[PDB]
């Protein structure tokens, strides 16, 4: 009972930048974990603000929220051809103040670099 | 005519459903949990108030024969139901606060039976409030053409300081107490991810509050009208406002139609726990 909207993956020349928007809708009460997978997280954020990692991101890309539109952006700078994989959105929410919580995966998008 | 056979109706219904709960939970007695075994005390504070609708219920068809000693007792009974109830349910409520808020229980991993002995408190309060109408009540004939009737019976002095006592206390302390400790319940729980860490500890959490809560809203809509009928009585008694003398009978069918309310409230609970939750 979620609609995952992904936006942003396309062509693009080696050496520039992305940016890919993830964003829910639904009937959702509350959202409270986001991030993006290639089955290894590449970087996450939660209601907080606190932003972690994986072990292969050097800080070099960043991740931001909107909870006004409840949309996330993860924006990757100096991409290289071996970045060219499969990246799938992920989002927990819970749909009711006494229900269980539970996430939801997105379709998908494909990244190419060069 | 009517009010025998609904009185009957009511009196099998309820006895019906609150020994089938009585059993099931009782079958497995010998490990419950805190909430379990509120339940099953407020259950077994209401089969007795079941068990005394016939009486009422010959009184309604002809007049009251039995005698003074069962009108004590039947009064006694009325009025210590709503004070088990409103006690347990403080009680209950308290223990899902410091479930959901502090996260510190101590009822299961701390003293074996800290809850036997809460209850046994409860009922013994229940039983020290409910002394004052086991010794103001009698069958007086009142010599109304054969029309002995259970009323009680004040030297008029202390009536107003007795129905006051009355409210103050059971409409006062287990209402303050569970509206603090749901608005601090509510307030943790809409803004926090896991209770606990789990997915399997923190569901079955918010289901028992699910079904507490809503057996506490039960609780309020059925006994509110009563006290609020007793307060505006208690009001008016105290030469406030709207004493005119032609609101009396007014007065006397709201307190007979709450009374009739507060009577279903025991029919009602057993379905309650029978369709959520199943
Ligand atoms: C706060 C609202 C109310 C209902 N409630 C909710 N919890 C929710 N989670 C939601 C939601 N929409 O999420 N809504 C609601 Cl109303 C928790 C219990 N609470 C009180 C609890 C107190 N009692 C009054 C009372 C109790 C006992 C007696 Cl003897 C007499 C009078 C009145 C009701
Ligand atoms: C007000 C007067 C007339 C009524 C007499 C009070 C009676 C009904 C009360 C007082 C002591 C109570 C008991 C105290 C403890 C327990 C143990 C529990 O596991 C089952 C219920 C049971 C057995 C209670 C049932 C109700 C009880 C028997």
Same mark, same amino acid.
Request: with cysteine; proline share 3%.
């Given at each position: 009972?979620?609609?995952?909207?992904?936006?942003?993956?396309?062509?693009?020349?080696?050496?520039?930048?992305?940016?890919?928007?993830?964003?829910?809708?639904?009937?959702?009460?509350?959202?409270?974990?986001?991030?993006?997978?290639?089955?290894?997280?590449?970087?996450?954020?939660?209601?907080?603000?606190?932003?972690?990692?994986?072990?292969?991101?050097?800080?070099?890309?960043?991740?931001?929220?909107?909870?006004?539109?409840?949309?996330?952006?993860?924006?990757?700078?100096?991409?290289?051809?071996?970045?060219?994989?499969?990246?799938?959105?992920?989002?927990?929410?819970?749909?009711?103040?006494?229900?269980?919580?539970?996430?939801?995966?997105?379709?998908?998008?494909?990244?190419?670099?060069? | 005519?009517?009010?025998?056979?609904?009185?009957?109706?009511?009196?099998?219904?309820?006895?019906?459903?609150?020994?089938?709960?009585?059993?099931?939970?009782?079958?497995?007695?010998?490990?419950?949990?805190?909430?379990?075994?509120? +339940?099953?005390? $407020? *259950? /077994?504070?209401?089969?007795? =108030?079941?068990?005394? @609708? &016939?009486?009422?219920?010959?009184?309604? !068809?002809?007049?009251?024969?039995?005698?003074?000693?069962?009108?004590?007792?039947?009064?006694?009974?009325?009025?210590?139901?709503?004070?088990?109830?409103?006690?347990?349910?403080?009680?209950?409520?308290?223990?899902?606060?410091?479930?959901?808020?502090?996260?510190?229980?101590?009822?299961?991993?701390?003293?074996?039976?800290?809850?036997? +002995?809460?209850? $046994? *408190? /409860?009922?013994?309060?229940? =039983?020290?409030?409910? @002394? &004052?109408?086991?010794?103001?009540?009698? !069958?007086?004939?009142?010599?109304?053409?054969?029309?002995?009737?259970?009323?009680?019976?004040?030297?008029?002095?202390?009536?107003?300081?007795?129905?006051?006592?009355?409210?103050?206390?059971?409409?006062?302390?287990?209402?303050?107490?569970?509206?603090?400790?749901?608005?601090?319940?509510?307030?943790?729980?809409?803004?926090?991810?896991? +209770?606990?860490?789990?997915?399997?500890?923190?569901?079955? =959490?918010?289901?028992?509050?699910?079904?507490?809560?809503?057996?506490?809203?039960?609780?309020?809509?059925?006994?509110?009208?009563?006290?609020?009928?007793?307060?505006?009585?208690?009001?008016?008694?105290?030469?406030?406002?709207?004493?005119?003398?032609?609101?009396?009978?007014?007065?006397?069918?709201?307190?007979?139609?709450?009374?009739?309310?507060?009577?279903?409230?025991?029919?009602?609970?057993?379905?309650?726990?029978?369709?959520?939750?199943?």
């Amino acid at each position: 009972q979620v609609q995952l909207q992904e936006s942003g993956g396309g062509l693009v020349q080696a050496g520039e930048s992305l940016r890919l928007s993830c964003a829910a809708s639904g009937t959702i009460f509350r959202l409270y974990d986001m991030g993006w997978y290639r089955r290894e997280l590449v970087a996450s954020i939660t209601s907080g603000g606190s932003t972690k990692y994986g072990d292969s991101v050097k800080g070099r890309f960043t991740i931001s929220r909107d909870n006004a539109k409840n949309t996330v952006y993860l924006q990757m700078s100096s991409l290289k051809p071996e970045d060219t994989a499969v990246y799938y959105c992920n989002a927990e929410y819970r749909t009711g103040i006494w229900e269980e919580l539970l996430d939801g995966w997105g379709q998908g998008t494909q990244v190419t670099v060069s | 005519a009517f009010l025998p056979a609904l009185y009957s109706l009511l009196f099998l219904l309820g006895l019906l459903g609150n020994g089938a709960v009585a059993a099931v939970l009782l079958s497995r007695r010998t490990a419950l949990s805190s909430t379990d075994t509120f +339940l099953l005390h $407020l *259950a /077994v504070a209401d089969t007795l =108030l079941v068990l005394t @609708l &016939p009486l009422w219920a010959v009184d309604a !068809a002809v007049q009251w024969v039995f005698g003074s000693g069962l009108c004590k007792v039947a009064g006694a009974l009325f009025n210590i139901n709503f004070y088990a109830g409103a006690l347990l349910l403080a009680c209950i409520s308290f223990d899902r606060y410091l479930n959901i808020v502090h996260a510190t229980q101590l009822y299961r991993r701390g003293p074996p039976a800290r809850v036997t +002995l809460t209850c $046994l *408190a /409860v009922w013994g309060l229940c =039983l020290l409030f409910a @002394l &004052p109408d086991f010794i103001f009540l009698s !069958a007086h004939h009142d010599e109304r053409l054969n029309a002995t009737h259970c009323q009680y019976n004040f030297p008029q002095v202390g009536r107003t300081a007795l129905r006051v006592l009355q409210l103050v206390a059971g409409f006062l302390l287990p209402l303050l107490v569970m509206a603090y400790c749901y608005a601090h319940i509510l307030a943790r729980l809409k803004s926090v991810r896991l +209770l606990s860490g789990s997915r399997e500890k923190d569901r079955n =959490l918010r289901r028992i509050t699910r079904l507490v809560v809503v057996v506490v809203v039960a609780f309020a809509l059925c006994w509110t009208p009563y006290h609020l009928v007793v307060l505006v009585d208690i009001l008016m008694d105290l030469g406030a406002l709207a004493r005119n003398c032609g609101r009396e009978s007014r007065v006397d069918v709201a307190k007979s139609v709450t009374s009739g309310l507060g009577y279903m409230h025991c029919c009602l609970n057993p379905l309650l726990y029978a369709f959520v939750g199943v």
